[PDB]
Design a binder for these strands. Structure first.
Length: 69
RNA sequence: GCGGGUGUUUACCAGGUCAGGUCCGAAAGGAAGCAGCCAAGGCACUU
């Protein structure tokens, strides 16, 4: 379960836009997303880095909920 | 070696285009621009 499936699953428009600025590798291996990438992304989707982190924050909790059944 | 071709590779770090999202604007319209793609470079092979 990567950022892709989570993509298929109105704050949504923004959560989609953020993921839509990532590369295929970033959507598949979310951990490789550190500072520099975050800035590229944040700016790429007209967002604030803090927002991106929120997005990553959610997907993480969402991820865990998966790895429990 | 020069040129051509082919496979593959490359988040951002002044190439082009720019979905989605963003900014300015009441609006009409403007601005920037990630991913993709194209191009370009790399690693090889080839002619």
């Amino acid at each position: 379960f990567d950022l892709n499936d989570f993509l298929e699953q109105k704050v949504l428009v923004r959560m989609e836009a953020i993921i839509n600025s990532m590369t295929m590798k970033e959507r598949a291996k979310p951990e490789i997303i550190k500072g520099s990438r975050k800035r590229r992304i944040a700016a790429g989707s007209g967002m604030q880095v803090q927002d991106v982190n929120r997005l990553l924050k959610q997907f993480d909790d969402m991820q865990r909920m998966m790895k429990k059944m």
